[PDB]
Design a protein around this ligand. Structure first.
Ligand SMILES: Cc1ncc(C[n+]2csc(CCOP(=O)(O)OP(=O)(O)O)c2C)c(N)n1
Ligand SMILES: Cc1ncc(C[n+]2csc(CCOP(=O)(O)OP(=O)(O)O)c2C)c(N)n1
Ligand code: SF4
Ligand code: SF4
Ligand code: SF4
Ligand SMILES: [Ca+2]
Ligand SMILES: [Mg+2]
Ligand SMILES: [Mg+2]
Lengths: 1177, 47, 246, 182, 62
């Protein structure tokens, strides 16, 4: 039933998993969220599995929940699958133990992703899959997209038959997202492969009251060993099942697999043993070297668990003398990585001749593994052999790196076309390239591989695309480095990056550039690029596609036309017809005008003759060249310094605001509002000072000049400031960047040196708060992100003495994506102490911070009390001890103590002076989104927020999993369209604030900055001031909410959210503890909902459903605010000592050294009944 | 039924980070970098 | 400072862990609940660690919460320990990856208990400890009650000095609860064994706004490999530290 | 009866709910295909209409199990194959104060906010009764337990009032010694 | 540390059993057995017989 489709690993795997399953419980995690999202897509559409039903997909609060739901569905007798990646798999392991213990036939599809050790990472390696060897799952591996399809099918069939659960894993962001043209089987063909007898048996033995059994008992030393050892036959039978199903599938598709496959010279002496996508690249390298007589080969591992040495040795050539076992994992201190240990054990158990076995690390965090590295590995085997190496990085901290020659010629098979497309984010380059791959795949007999490198920056990020089109199948599983055809879609990059580092000789270079002239190219093209274009005799085609697009009334079509006429792969008819399938006249006119516009540029011949941390590491990382950074550059514990965003200077906004000084009322709201802190209120003296400044108003601002400086380069162009600017004649007007950068860059460079006036006005006030330095500046957030202004204001109030426990979400992606760190240190150097632990445990991390600070400051208090027994030091110490709970007094007397105890390094005084960082009381903060506070880290948040210790948690409730593709949350409100809510979510917002308010010793307050800025400030101050737990939930806007007028309306949207009653404001103060700061609903909820694209789409799809849902939303917010108004109107000792009866059993779960004293066990009756029985007898 | 909250919106509902990549995604769209729609209309009118 | 007392493995281990720690976040799980319970007992009474303070003990909602709180206390610069058994250790592994990744010097005292596969079980085997080889902890084992005392002491000292977290494990319901007559060291004697320079350094590099740093970043294919491979020297140094402290 | 873990009983029961939902929908689709003898048609229609009622589903499942004895061919054989899915099933989640209150709390909250027909019964002993009686969040103010040797200072975890904020969940507190009829 | 392991191991030892209190279904051996086997593979010298055994699962008597 083979049909050809062009897809990535997620689609190929989800196709087969949808066929072979009926239940799927899924949590979102990159890079595995695609499989679950498209499975839910097909379920909503109505796709049928092999049994003729739509697959039932559910979303859990966590991946522990996904594994538990999988356990329940398998136990109840349903075919179940789930999709996983690294942190998900780690959370899944303990239930995987139960799933394999009960011999339940589930299939997990895992996308290989790094485990967060020194830093979170979403890219590919085998750490998570190796962390799960012990669970007892069978583990199958897939090298390519076609192999992902085939192996997912094999895994489902063998799981059904063998009663052993399977883990299918393919490499993340190397197979999960690499588009390739593969043939898949029709569902009718894969349906006939099922073992019906085993399926009926599996349904029979499942949990059902009609034939009940007890599963999950508790056993004692007496019988646990036997119940462990009674499951051996199923594992002794699973490998033969996998082999037989490989045969049965190969009969259908025609591609034959084994548990271990061998590729290369049969009489080979140097053999690599690998697993995963690298097995493809090595194979390609072999096909090069074998044409030069090289006696080298490769063993690809398919079935990792259970490891079958019979198959391994059947694959291994007996002439092989030296083996390298390549592993994509690091285990600190292990004698070797897991695959190396498996191969070593196989050779020990055989007992025959033992060849040399070498272990090497490669490709950690989807690090490149190119043909040159494979060649270097084989060369290491050939002579001067090295054990326990790393290949790919320049190691200089332990000398564990092979030398790699980066002059390896084209190993990709002849007949192939390599294309590199550099583009600016959302200019449509990747969409056009996906369309190109699909068009060529559907219309030709060419294999089309396509990979998409992205950027950490959400707005204005670079996006690189590598495309291969080949007559032979594409095994090149690595980024292109020698391109047939380069295309720059943004001339800004022609100076910022090296666009021609991957060119070849004569390789066509197509450049988007307005300056389409000889002289203007002479003036703009950097000398290096010109010398390259002239030297290696390129075909340079320059076209100004923006003018062409503007004429025809989006440069997507001109660029796609340039590709289809200049790549050599074919085109004109195909692109024209594809446009027709998707107004039309404009697109075809753009196509034809581009066709005419492309001509070779007759370049001049003379063209061939023509902090410190930032300079060393950060600038090379930003230019996408940190692959050359050695290991000496990175801290061992993975820490990064603050204030790295300051030197970014990325002018990517098209429109930047301009200050009209005459209209300004000096309200400091454009600064209070800006998400990327590009607005600097400069308050100066007349002696301190194009730099037009005003006269600052008010008593505190008496002799000061006032100015609002625009950071033109660090502006995102969102327009929140100009849209919030009070005067009806705007003091801020959005103007093109090119007409405002040249006169404003020097102005900001000058303004950066004016001292910040932070003592004139209180920091609790709006204007005064904005007169303080912001310690979170220039995030990587989306232009207009509704999360960054809140955290910036929080740091403007508390940044000097702050601990941040940042959950996983957008907060951590923009708050720290290497090498750019928005957080910075103030003039005294006291920045925020920022740390991200995990997604589910930010709360416990912050609570632990609280405990550590509590312990160390109590130790300091005890030292000071011991030092009380010179008079000035005594007064300072007593003053600090009395007022150590007040940040102001503690700061004052800590400064006193740090003055008095300078250089004091002896005695109690030396000890007290040693910990000078514990003087001023610290503010530990917990920052996370809706997912953390609402779904996964919820239990830890609830515990730390019910413990009673002085911790403060700030919720950036975007009502969605903004970071991961925007999937449904519990904050996702009724009638909202998201992922896993394609028909509109039917359960309401998770009433997290009202949940926490039931405690009564927790400060709870809801804020919205667009509505009122003063309530937010009061809430922050009285939240950090409350001696106890404090929770604050801030309405935030995300680009996923699809604001139809734009992100510049964020504040306005925020404002509307509180006017209509959707997002009330209130404060619960335990110190009538409840109060409503928000007015009654305006009834404009329908306008607010229709303003956002989620409800607009919900209407465009299902109007009656949408209107019923919006009615229920309005009604439920009416009654929720009705409830708000209804409640706003108004030493050591053990509990077992001295009791007449026993408070302890005799089970081992209740045994202690103190226990065991004779006591009455409630077996002779109650005390009264005992007295009666004694009296009668 | 199935429909995505990103179709037919004037502005992008997706970033360009790898955490937000799908086969459907990648169509050219306005990134909120030239200002709001109203402010864009004003800038067009004045110039 | 050797004094003889008759106790089981929980008491022997909790004695030394109380001496050598200042923060402890604990979730109850058999057979490890005794160590946390008696640590909280001594804290309520007023027993002092080697630094002359009562050990701060807190209880979490889970063992994931215990491992997270341990991470926060180690990151903020406090000597931290926790007590674990099987299901607890399984819930703890993903944070143990972070703890060893940042080279934070914690000590986990694990009582070996079965992993629930075909049935829940509270009794002893090494399934949980073997499930955590990959995390990058150093793993120390104790055969008897006396060895549990000695090895807990060695684990705390070597964790302080080596900046590599340690897992100390003794067999559950075979050493955790077997009463034996053992000699323990006075807290004054075990206090002199600490490497003061390493302790001061550990407090210096910790998370603090006065000298702030960003820990827990998100990295891309470009630099993750190097940040992984930059922690090798500490592991090449830990075994010699363990031998010298023995 | 089945025990999964301490923290995931709720997700285990929810998965049971999903498996039963899927298999009984598959049964409904098979029966709708089998509608096209008259007594079997009446039995199948009666079960299909009232499969959400345990009483009617039990009655017509008994009818179907009488009519389809030994039927091992076609749609009828398939329908008779899964005779254990006729009467509507009641998936229950049983756990104490620790599970509902401390560790399995997130899974309980999710399954109990999802909107699927699951029922959770809390045996709130106000303590970790099984493990030595350590403090819980159900452990109320001023109670002495383990890790509360001086008397617990935080109150009982208002789990019922937390769940009642949803508004689509039946919540009811019971005590048998007080009244058996409630 | 194979240095310490081989300093402990007598060179006259001809047969070694590595006892492990764990079960991994389908693994080529339990973790301690794999560690000792890797130590002997990396040494490259004479390799004695190495046996693996399970004992004492669930505090089973030994
Ligand atoms: C255990 C685990 N599951 C999944 C993920 C993947 N992940 C990272 S961030 C995120 C969503 C964050 O949600 P939220 O708190 O709402 O954040 P925001 O929407 O503000 O980004 C997910 C699922 C993870 N890091 N860890
Ligand atoms: C993750 C995990 N942590 C700890 C345990 C140990 N444990 C088993 S039962 C229990 C307490 C049960 O509490 P609760 O729900 O109140 O039950 P009850 O008091 O009715 O026994 C604990 C801590 C475990 N099984 N799993
Ligand atoms: S928002 Fe407008 S009026 Fe207010 S300070 Fe800024 S420029 Fe001036
Ligand atoms: S609010 Fe938006 S438009 Fe205004 S300066 Fe900040 S990023 Fe630029
Ligand atoms: S929260 Fe939304 S708007 Fe802000 S950075 Fe994340 S995806 Fe962009
Ligand atoms: Ca507080
Ligand atoms: Mg969110
Ligand atoms: Mg209880």
């Amino acid at each position: 039933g083979k049909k050809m489709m062009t897809t990535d690993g997620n689609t190929a795997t989800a196709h087969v998993a949808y066929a072979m399953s009926e239940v799927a419980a899924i949590y979102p995690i990159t890079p595995s969220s695609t499989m679950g999202e498209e499975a839910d897509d097909w379920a909503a559409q109505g796709r049928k599995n092999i049994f003729g039903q739509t697959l039932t997909i559910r979303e859990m609060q966590s991946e522990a929940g996904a594994a538990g739901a999988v356990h329940g569905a398998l136990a109840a007798g349903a075919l179940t699958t789930t999709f996983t990646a690294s942190q998900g798999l780690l959370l899944m392991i303990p239930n995987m133990y139960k799933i394999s213990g009960e011999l339940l036939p589930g299939v997990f599809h895992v996308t290989a992703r790094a485990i967060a050790a020194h830093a979170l990472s979403i890219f590919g390696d085998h750490q998570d899959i190796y962390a799960a060897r012990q669970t007892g799952f069978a583990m199958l591996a897939s090298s390519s997209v076609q192999e992902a399809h085939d192996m997912a099918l094999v895994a489902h069939l063998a799981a059904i038959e063998s009663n052993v659960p399977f883990m299918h894993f393919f490499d993340g962001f190397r197979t999960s997202h690499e588009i390739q043209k593969i043939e898949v089987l029709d569902y009718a063909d894969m349906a006939s492969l099922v073992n019906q007898k085993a399926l009926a048996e599996f349904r029979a033995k499942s949990m059902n009251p009609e034939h009940p059994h007890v599963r999950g008992t508790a056993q004692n030393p007496d019988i646990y060993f036997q119940g462990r050892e009674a499951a051996n036959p199923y594992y002794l039978k699973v490998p033969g099942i996998v082999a037989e199903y490989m045969q049965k599938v190969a009969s259908l598709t025609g591609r034959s697999y084994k548990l271990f496959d061998y590729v290369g010279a049969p009489d080979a002496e140097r053999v690599i043993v690998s697993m995963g996508s690298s097995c493809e690249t090595i194979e390609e390298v072999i096909n090069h070297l074998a044409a030069k007589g090289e006696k080298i080969g490769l063993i690809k591992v398919r079935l990792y668990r259970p490891f079958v040495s019979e198959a391994f040795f059947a694959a291994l050539p007996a002439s092989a003398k030296v083996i390298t076992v390549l592993d994509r994992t690091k285990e600190p201190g292990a004698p070797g990585d897991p695959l190396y240990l498996d191969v070593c054990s196989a050779f020990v158990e055989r007992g025959e001749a033992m060849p040399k076995i070498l272990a090497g690390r490669y490709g950690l965090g989807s690090k490149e593994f190119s043909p040159a590295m494979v060649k270097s590995v084989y060369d290491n085997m050939s002579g001067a052999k090295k054990n326990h190496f790393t290949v790919g990085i320049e190691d200089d901290v332990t000398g564990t790196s092979l030398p790699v020659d980066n002059a390896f010629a084209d190993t990709t098979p002849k007949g192939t076309i390599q294309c590199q497309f550099w583009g600016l984010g959302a200019d449509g380059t990747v969409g056009a390239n996906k369309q190109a791959i699909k068009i060529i795949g559907d219309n030709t007999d060419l294999f089309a591989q396509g990979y998409f490198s992205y950027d950490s920056k959400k707005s204005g990020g670079i996006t690189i695309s590598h495309l291969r089109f080949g007559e032979k199948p594409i095994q090149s599983t690595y980024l292109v480095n020698r391109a047939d055809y380069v295309a720059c879609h943004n001339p800004a990059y022609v100076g910022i990056y090296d666009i021609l580092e991957g060119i070849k000789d004569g390789g066509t270079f197509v450049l988007n550039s307005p300056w389409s002239s000889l002289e203007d190219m002479d003036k703009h093209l950097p000398s290096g690029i010109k010398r390259t274009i002239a030297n290696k005799k390129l075909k340079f085609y320059n076209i100004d596609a923006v003018k062409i697009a503007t004429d025809v009334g989006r440069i997507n079509m001109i660029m796609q036309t340039a590709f289809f006429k200049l790549a050599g792969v074919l085109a004109v008819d195909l692109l024209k017809k594809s446009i027709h399938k998707a107004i039309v006249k404009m697109n075809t006119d753009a196509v034809d005008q581009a066709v005419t516009s492309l001509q070779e540029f007759k370049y001049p011949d003379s063209w061939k003759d023509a902090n410190e941390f930032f300079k060393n590491v950060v600038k090379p990382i930003l230019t996408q060249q940190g692959d050359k950074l050695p290991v000496s550059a990175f801290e061992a514990d993975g820490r990064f310094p603050l204030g790295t965003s300051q030197f970014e200077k990325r002018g990517v906004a098209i429109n930047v605001p301009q200050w009209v000084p005459e209209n300004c009322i000096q309200c400091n709201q454009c600064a209070f509002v800006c998400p990327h802190s590009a607005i600097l209120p400069v308050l100066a003296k007349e002696e301190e000072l194009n730099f037009t400044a005003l006269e600052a108003k008010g008593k505190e601002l008496k002799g000061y000049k006032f100015r609002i400086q625009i950071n033109t380069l660090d502006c995102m162009g969102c327009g929140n400031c100009a849209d919030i600017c009070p005067p009806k004649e705007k003091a801020l007007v959005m103007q093109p960047l090119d007409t405002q950068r040249d006169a404003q860059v020097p102005n900001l460079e000058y303004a950066a040196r004016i001292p910040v006036k932070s003592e004139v006005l209180p920091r609790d006030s709006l204007k005064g708060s904005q007169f303080q330095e912001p310690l979170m500046e220039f995030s990587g957030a989306c232009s207009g992100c509704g999360e960054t202004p809140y955290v910036r204001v929080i740091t403007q109030l508390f940044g000097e003495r702050m601990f941040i426990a940042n959950a996983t979400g957008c907060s951590s992606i923009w708050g720290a994506s290497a090498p750019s760190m928005p957080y910075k240190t103030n003039r005294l150097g006291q920045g925020p102490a920022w740390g991200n632990s995990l997604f589910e445990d930010a709360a416990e991390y912050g609570f632990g911070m609280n405990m550590s600070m509590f312990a160390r400051r109590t130790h300091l208090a005890d030292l000071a009390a011991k030092a009380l027994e010179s008079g000035d030091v005594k007064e300072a110490l007593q003053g600090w001890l009395a007022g150590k709970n007040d940040p102001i007094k503690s700061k004052e007397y800590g400064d006193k103590l740090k003055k008095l105890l300078a250089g004091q390094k002896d005695g109690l005084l030396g000890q007290i002076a040693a910990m000078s960082d514990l003087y001023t009381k610290k503010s530990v903060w917990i920052f996370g989104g809706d997912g953390w506070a609402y779904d996964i880290g919820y239990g830890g948040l609830d515990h730390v927020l019910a413990s009673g210790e002085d911790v403060n948690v700030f919720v950036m409730d975007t009502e969605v999993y903004s970071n991961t593709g925007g999937q449904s949350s519990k904050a996702t409100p009724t009638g909202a369209v998201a992922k896993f809510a394609a028909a509109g979510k039917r359960t309401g917002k998770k009433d997290l604030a009202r949940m926490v308010m039931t405690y009564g010793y927790v400060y709870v307050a809801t804020v919205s900055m667009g509505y009122s800025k003063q309530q937010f400030l009061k809430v922050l101050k009285e939240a950090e001031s409350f001696p106890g737990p404090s929770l604050v939930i801030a309405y935030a806007t995300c680009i996923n909410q699809g604001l139809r007028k734009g992100m510049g309306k964020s504040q306005d949207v925020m404002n509307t959210a509180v006017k209509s009653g959707y997002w009330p404001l209130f404060r619960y103060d335990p110190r009538n503890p409840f109060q409503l700061d928000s007015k009654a609903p305006d009834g404009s909820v329908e306008e607010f909902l229709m303003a956002q694209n989620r409800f607009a789409v919900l209407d465009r799809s299902f109007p009656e459903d949408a209107k019923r849902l919006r009615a229920q939303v309005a009604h439920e917010l009416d009654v929720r605010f009705k409830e708000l108004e209804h409640m706003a109107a108004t030493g050591s000792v053990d509990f077992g000592e001295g009791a007449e009866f026993c408070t302890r059993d005799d089970t081992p779960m209740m045994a202690r050294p103190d226990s065991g004293e004779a006591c009455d066990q409630n077996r002779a009756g109650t005390s009264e009944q005992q007295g009666d029985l004694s009296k009668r007898t």
